[PDB]
Amino acid sequence: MLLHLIYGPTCSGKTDMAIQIAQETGWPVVALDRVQCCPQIATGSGRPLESELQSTRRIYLDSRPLTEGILDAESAHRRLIFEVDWRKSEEGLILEGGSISLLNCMAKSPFWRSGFQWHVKRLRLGDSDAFLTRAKQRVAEMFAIREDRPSLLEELAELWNYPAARPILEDIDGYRCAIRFARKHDLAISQLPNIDAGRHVELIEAIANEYLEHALSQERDFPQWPE
Ligand SMILES: Nc1ncnc2c1ncn2[C@@H]1O[C@H](COP(=O)(O)O)[C@@H](O)[C@H]1O
Ligand SMILES: CC(C)=CCSP(=O)(O)OP(=O)(O)O
């Protein structure tokens, strides 16, 4: 089997790159992401829109309530090995994502050491300013009110109802920022999606800066995959 590994920092265009290869080849893409396995934060966690898949398939390693905690990395790694192992008859698969703890498991795992052909692509963080520009547009996309999917702020207000979701979302990019932003301005979290004209802009810029923080960590902690 051919495994087309696309990894790299947040807001690097990885997902679209993967969808395009998947349109051409017909192969599924397995999301190398733990946080995307909670569909209740589909939007904030980066899941492509159903419209954006262009009819390609995108495979998550689990589907789990947020309050069950984010999928741990060794469990996600067991799962990934299984989604690849039972498709072993197929020409190729696309593995795309930015999970730091999960890429590190793949790099320690003997499973990948043997038995596959590979095309490996590592996307890198650009200049920070260009990064923040892409980040801010991404966040505004995740903030847009559509008919077909809850916004980030809507996902957050829904879950804030459940006290056990609170600690968990405080450890997730975007959400952590949005929560801190609410307390900073004395806003109920319920209120974030009604927020004045130019406070929308502060919050977007604040999240983008949390995304770049994360992308810096990804660049530090990522494995160096051989290619
Ligand atoms: N898709 C995602 N969306 C939001 N935050 C994420 C995402 N993936 C990782 N994180 C953050 O980075 C830490 C996850 O570690 P990892 O999966 O090992 O990169 C999480 O604890 C979140 O704080
Ligand atoms: C880490 C966050 C906020 C979203 C996950 S999707 P990504 O950000 O890994 O994706 P792209 O490189 O934009 O496809």
Q: Could you give the domains of the chain? A: 1-124 (3.40.50.300), 125-227 (1.10.287.890)
Tell me, using a 6 A CB cutoff, whether residue 48 lines ligand 2: no
The residue type of 48 is P
Tell me the resolution in Å.
Answer: 2.1
Atom of ligand 2 nearest to the CA of 15: 14
- Give the pair of three-digit tokens for residue 112: 């990948």
Q: Are strands 58-59 and 29-31 parallel, antiparallel or unpaired?
A: parallel
d(CA 121, CA 206): 29
Task: Tell me, in angstroms, the distance from the centre of ligand 1 to residue 91's CA.
Answer: 30
* Residue to probe by mutation, ligand 2, list 6, 11, 43, most atoms within 8 Å of CB: 11
Using an 8 Å Cβ cutoff, are 2 and 116 in contact?
A: yes
Tell me, using a 6 A CB cutoff, whether residue 177 lines ligand 1: no
- Tokens 């790159």 -> residue: 17
Q: Which long-range contacts (CB under 8 A, 24 or more apart) does 20-26 make?
A: 21/94, 22/56, 22/57, 22/58, 22/94, 23/54, 23/55, 23/56, 25/91, 25/92, 25/94
d(CA 68, CA 105): 21
d(CA 195, CA 166): 21
Which residues contact residue 66 at a Cβ distance below 8 angstroms, ignoring those fewer than 6 apart? Answer: 38, 40, 41, 159, 165, 168, 169
Tell me, using a 6 A CB cutoff, whether residue 10 lines ligand 2: yes
Which residues contact residue 163 at a Cβ distance below 8 angstroms, ignoring those fewer than 6 apart? Answer: none
Closest residue by Cα to residue 155 from 47, 17, 75, 21: 47
Helices vs strands, H then E, count in the chain: 8, 5
